[PDB]
């Protein structure tokens, strides 16, 4: 019905696996069809660009490479620890993500 | 619901269509099912003119391809209205 | 050939069996079948014309149910039948079955 994403633009995530394991960053973008997130300054790649109006002088640019969403963990804004996410029902009763270490909202 | 704006789709843009403005002949793409009589009325209520003569012709879609995939463009009909001596359709005088 | 409008009797298919030889009961060796082929047995259909309500109604009916046509005519008296078409009379008549 919808892909399940445990993370979103632009909560702050720990990158827990791959070359960039350990890095922290904002999620610039979420790409659910590809099940992937773009994290700021994580997974940089050198792309060639043709000499073009958009890029005269040509050469290369840096781009952020998407990460498989499972590599990423939201950092709790209360305790500052990376966490699994839980759902808690409020009184509304809207539902929200809360850190699984303490109980803090993650938004 | 059916309005004149349903019958006249777009103006025909080409050397040949433009060549007609001089003698008062405006050429539109119209809906493929629309009658000379109905086009006369539609053009009259849309561009506030007096339509005096209507020429229509069918235009078959060109067969066209994209890689493996053969297809056809939509079939169209074009109409050529003659407005009364002296009138003009300014939207088309354009150019 | 066809269907009795009264009894419903239709053409049926029957075998025609050809036999040879002397029956056992007559001291023969027994009967041998020398052919079986399908054939049809038709109802004995005939036309019965009847006047009912000053109209001429006609039935295609197996001879066995020829009397059932006239019996229908009798039951017809209790009916408001005049002015009707002969298609219409026959329908009413038939409905009485």
């Amino acid at each position: 019905m919808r892909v399940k994403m445990h993370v979103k633009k632009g909560d702050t995530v720990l990158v827990a696996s791959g070359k960039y394991k350990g890095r922290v960053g904002k999620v610039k973008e979420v790409l659910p069809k590809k099940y992937a997130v773009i994290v700021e300054g994580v997974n940089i790649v050198k792309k060639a660009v043709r000499v073009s109006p958009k890029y005269p002088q040509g050469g290369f640019i840096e781009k952020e490479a998407p990460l498989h969403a499972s590599k990423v963990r939201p950092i709790c804004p209360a305790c500052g620890k990376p966490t699994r996410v839980r759902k808690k029902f409020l009184e509304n009763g809207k539902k929200i993500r809360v850190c699984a270490k303490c109980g803090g909202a993650l938004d | 619901m059916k309005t004149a704006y349903d019958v006249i789709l777009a103006p025909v843009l080409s050397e040949k269509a433009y060549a007609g403005f001089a003698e008062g002949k405006y050429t539109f793409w119209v809906h493929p099912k629309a009658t000379k009589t109905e086009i006369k009325n539609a053009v009259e209520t849309a561009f506030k003119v007096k339509v005096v003569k209507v020429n229509t012709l069918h235009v078959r879609g060109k067969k066209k391809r994209l890689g493996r995939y053969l297809g056809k463009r939509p079939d169209r009909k074009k109409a050529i209205v003659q407005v009364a001596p002296g009138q003009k359709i300014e939207a088309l005088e354009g150019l | 050939s066809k269907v009795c409008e009264i009894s419903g009797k239709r053409p049926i298919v029957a075998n025609s069996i050809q036999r040879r030889g002397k029956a056992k009961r007559e001291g023969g060796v027994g009967k041998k079948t020398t052919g079986i082929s399908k054939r049809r047995q038709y109802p004995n259909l005939q036309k019965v014309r009847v006047r009912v309500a000053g109209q001429e109604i006609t039935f295609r009916v197996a001879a066995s149910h020829i009397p059932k046509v006239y019996e229908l005519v009798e039951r017809a008296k209790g009916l408001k039948l005049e002015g009707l078409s002969p298609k219409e009379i026959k329908k009413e008549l038939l409905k009485l079955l």
């Binding site: - | 619901m1 309005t3 704006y5 006249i8 789709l9 103006p11 843009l13 849309a46 939207a91 | -």
Partner: protein, 70 residues
């Protein structure tokens, strides 16, 4: 068109009468033709306007139908 503009359109339309609804579709069907003509000579950068108008008309006729249905 913005979601709130859409509600707004519906509320307003629903207040209208059939005749007023008809008048307004005709006006919009007219406004679409202009858009078309502009789109065809390459002078409509704001092309989302076409999908928009088309749905407005749909919403309107939809509502016209509502009224006349009972």
């Amino acid at each position: 068109m913005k979601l709130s503009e859409v509600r707004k359109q519906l509320e307003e339309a629903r207040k209208l009468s059939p005749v007023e609804l008809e008048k307004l579709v005709r006006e919009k069907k007219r406004e679409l033709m202009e858009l078309r003509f502009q789109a065809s000579i390459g002078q409509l950068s704001q092309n989302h306007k076409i999908r928009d108008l088309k749905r407005q008309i749909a919403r309107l006729l939809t509502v016209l139908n509502e009224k006349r249905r009972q």
